[PDB]
Amino acid sequence: NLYFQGNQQVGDCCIIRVSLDVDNGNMYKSILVTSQDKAPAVIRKAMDKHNLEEEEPEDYELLQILSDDRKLKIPENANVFYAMNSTANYDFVLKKRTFGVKVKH
Amino acid sequence: NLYFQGNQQVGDCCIIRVSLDVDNGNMYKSILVTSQDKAPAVIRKAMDKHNLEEEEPEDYELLQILSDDRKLKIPENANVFYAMNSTANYDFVLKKRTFKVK
């Protein structure tokens, strides 16, 4: 079996696939998303599976892969189970943000 | 001596310091900027010194560090010697660029 983690005793949930660009490609790990889960709880689970223990969830974002050219950003503190496109591919990318500095463009 | 590279035979230049976030910190390397160098040529020199040979200059950008909370983005194909703030610190950061997100 695959091992998963969740902070819910009972109810609806889904298994998604979370990608990370590593070793000149993309490694996908399966992640449990409970109906109550917001983006940071899902990011921590994905980081644990991708062995990013010394890193922080605040430095990453979750984007649902709609197609090869389209991505859907999951807001920083949105409920994943409802913000995601439930009829589209349950494939996501864990992306490091490019961030308290004023940048003159 | 420090070693540098440049595609100019004669004329004015400046030595800038280019930072890369690596090994829980920021390593700075000194980079030669000739009066004729545009951002891609400077980025390639910074990448060589920071050992990013397997990476591409199109994936990075230069930002001049004006202060701890102020930065000046050098446009992708701007002449660095002229786009930079000439009176500010010649300290820069080599940063991975941010890229159809709905």
Peptide-bond breaks in chain B following residues (C–N over 2.5 A)? 99
∠ CA A12-A14-A20, nearest 5°, is 150
From start to end of chain A, where are the E strands?
13-21, 26-34, 60-65, 71-73, 91-96, 102-104
CB under 8 Å to A81, separation ≥6 — which residues? A12, A13, A14, A33, A34, A35, A36, A37
Place of tokens 């000046």: B72
Q: Contact B101/A66, CB-based, under 8 Å? A: no
Q: Contact A71/B101, CB-based, under 8 Å? A: yes
Domain region containing B2: 1-102
CA distance A56 to B96: 18
Q: Contact A98/B100, CB-based, under 8 Å? A: no
What is the resolution of the experimental data for this entry, in Å? 2.1
Instruction: Please answer whether residues B5 and B45 qualify as being in contact, where contact means their C-beta atoms are separated by less than 8 angstroms.
Output: yes
CA distance B69 to B71: 7
Tokens of B60: 């990075």
CATH number of the CATH domain containing A98: 3.10.20.90
CA distance A90 to A16: 5
Instruction: Please answer whether residues B30 and B5 qualify as being in contact, where contact means their C-beta atoms are separated by less than 8 angstroms.
Output: no
b/e map B3-26, b = 16+ CB within 10 Å = eeebeeeeeeeeebebbbeeeeee
Give the minimum alpha-carbon distance from A98 to chain B in angstroms, rounded to a whole number. Answer: 6
Contacts of A98 in chain B (CB under 8 A): 95-98
Identify the experimental approach. X-ray
